[PDB]
Amino acid sequence: PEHDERKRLGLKTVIILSSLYLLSIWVKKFKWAGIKTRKFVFNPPK
Amino acid sequence: AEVTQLSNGIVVATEHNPSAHTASVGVVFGSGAANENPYNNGVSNLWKNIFLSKENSAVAAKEGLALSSNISRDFQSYIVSSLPGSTDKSLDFLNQSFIQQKANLLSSSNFEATKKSVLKQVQDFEDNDHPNRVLEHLHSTAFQNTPLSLPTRGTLESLENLVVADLESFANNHFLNSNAVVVGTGNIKHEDLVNSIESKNLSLQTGTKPVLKKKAAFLGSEVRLRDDTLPKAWISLAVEGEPVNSPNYFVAKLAAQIFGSYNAFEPASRLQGIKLLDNIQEYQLCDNFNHFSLSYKDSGLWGFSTATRNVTMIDDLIHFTLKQWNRLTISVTDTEVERAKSLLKLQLGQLYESGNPVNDANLLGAEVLIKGSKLSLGEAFKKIDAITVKDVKAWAGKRLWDQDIAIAGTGQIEGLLDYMRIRSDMSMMRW
């Protein structure tokens, strides 16, 4: 009996979660940019 | 108290003080390490070293003259000190070295013995002077691929590959007339010096201008020189500060005085009216720290440097210090500002008026090269006293609040957290 209403709620739930997913990816990449592009150099000690 | 400066063919700048026993004369060029390249980096320091060579120095010692030179970022200076009477013999030695001996100082026996000395000199620096070493790298990363990034002493690699021709090439491009200012401090009069200068004619490379470049820029970043064998951690952290001749030049310096400097072993230092001290003394987060407002021609750095043996609590040191700086935008008090004004005057005074004319020359020379004049000590105090809490807040909200930072450190810095953790502390959560 909940069929029609269930699918209507699913539509809203899936749209919000999809957005949150795409958005978190972006935020994560931003928060990690300093670490990902970090560079090292070795000069062996005398 | 008088700042006299006139131009005839060369710009002459002086500041007399009759109570001074000695007199210092010198030429200050409007070009320093900020004018060098990554490859000839260290040429200015090299020049300074031959100017003070055993040969050139002995010639001045017989005559009773003392030599002094200073290589900075925006400028460069060669100074000769003497008695108030020998103020003429200083000019003879000045001209004899910059025109007559501009080829006798550069001998293949003098140059090599000097190069070997700046090499052991710059090496010693990198191996042991950790606080200055860290501060130099701070400029290096903060202003990377820009003029202010080049270190004043030059790098070992660019130094050992330098030749007599590089010195000449630099000298013929920057030691020009339009990029110079003759300075005299001590007790001698302005009219006294300008006459001895306007007497001896000859222009020597007039109308020639130095090469141009690209504007300096701050880039939020970091350089970590980890070394677990050192007994401490030395760190420097800063935001983009104020260039000289900036409206907030003084607001910035005052802001740095609020947090000031500290030394955990000096009883009196532990008693200063600095809120940050309540936090750092409980677990002794550091042996020392000092805030600064470094100003240059195109930009500057505002931040602090610190040294510590408490290697497992470095994060608290950084965290408490940054929380205090957050205050400047939102809750700095009238009395903190007032305490700063008083202490800023005291330190600014002790600088502008020491018992040493060579310091006076550098301060005078550096100022006149950038703004064409020098602001009197009394004029500064008027500007300092006029600063309100509202000013400091407007400044901090622009320079400190949620702004990128630059970090540099050496020693046991495993406990210095990542960039983002430090950067996040440049502000606070609010409703």
Curated annotation (Swiss-Prot), chain A:
This is Cytochrome c1, heme protein, mitochondrial. Belongs to the cytochrome c family. It is found in: Mitochondrion inner membrane. Component of the ubiquinol-cytochrome c oxidoreductase, a multisubunit transmembrane complex that is part of the mitochondrial electron transport chain which drives oxidative phosphorylation. Residues 37-46 are mitochondrial matrix. The chain crosses the membrane at residues 3-36. Component of the ubiquinol-cytochrome c oxidoreductase (cytochrome b-c1 complex, complex III, CIII), a multisubunit enzyme composed of 10 subunits. The complex is composed of 3 respiratory subunits cytochrome b (COB), cytochrome c1 (CYT1) and Rieske protein (RIP1), 2 core protein subunits COR1 and QCR2, and 5 low-molecular weight protein subunits QCR6, QCR7, QCR8, QCR9 and QCR10. The chain holds residues 261 to 306 of 309 of the full protein. Present with 39900 molecules/cell in log phase SD medium.
Curated annotation (Swiss-Prot), chain B:
GO terms for cellular component: mitochondrial inner membrane; mitochondrion; respiratory chain complex III. Gene3D superfamilies: Metalloenzyme, LuxS/M16 peptidase-like. The keyword Electron transport applies. It is a peripheral membrane protein. Its main location: mitochondrion. Present with 19300 molecules/cell in log phase SD medium. The gene is COR1. GO terms for biological process: aerobic respiration; cellular respiration; mitochondrial electron transport, ubiquinol to cytochrome c; protein processing involved in protein targeting to mitochondrion; proton transmembrane transport. This is Cytochrome b-c1 complex subunit 1, mitochondrial. It comes from the Eukaryota. Component of the ubiquinol-cytochrome c oxidoreductase (cytochrome b-c1 complex, complex III, CIII), a multisubunit enzyme composed of 10 subunits. The complex is composed of 3 respiratory subunits cytochrome b (COB), cytochrome c1 (CYT1) and Rieske protein (RIP1), 2 core protein subunits COR1 and QCR2, and 5 low-molecular weight protein subunits QCR6, QCR7, QCR8, QCR9 and QCR10. Belongs to the peptidase M16 family. UQCRC1/QCR1 subfamily. PANTHER family: CYTOCHROME B-C1 COMPLEX SUBUNIT 1, MITOCHONDRIAL, METALLOPROTEASE. Keywords: Electron transport, Membrane, Mitochondrion, Mitochondrion inner membrane, Respiratory chain, Transit peptide, Transport. It comes from Saccharomyces cerevisiae (strain ATCC 204508 / S288c). Component of the ubiquinol-cytochrome c oxidoreductase, a multisubunit transmembrane complex that is part of the mitochondrial electron transport chain which drives oxidative phosphorylation. It is found in: Mitochondrion inner membrane. GO terms for molecular function: metal ion binding; metalloendopeptidase activity.
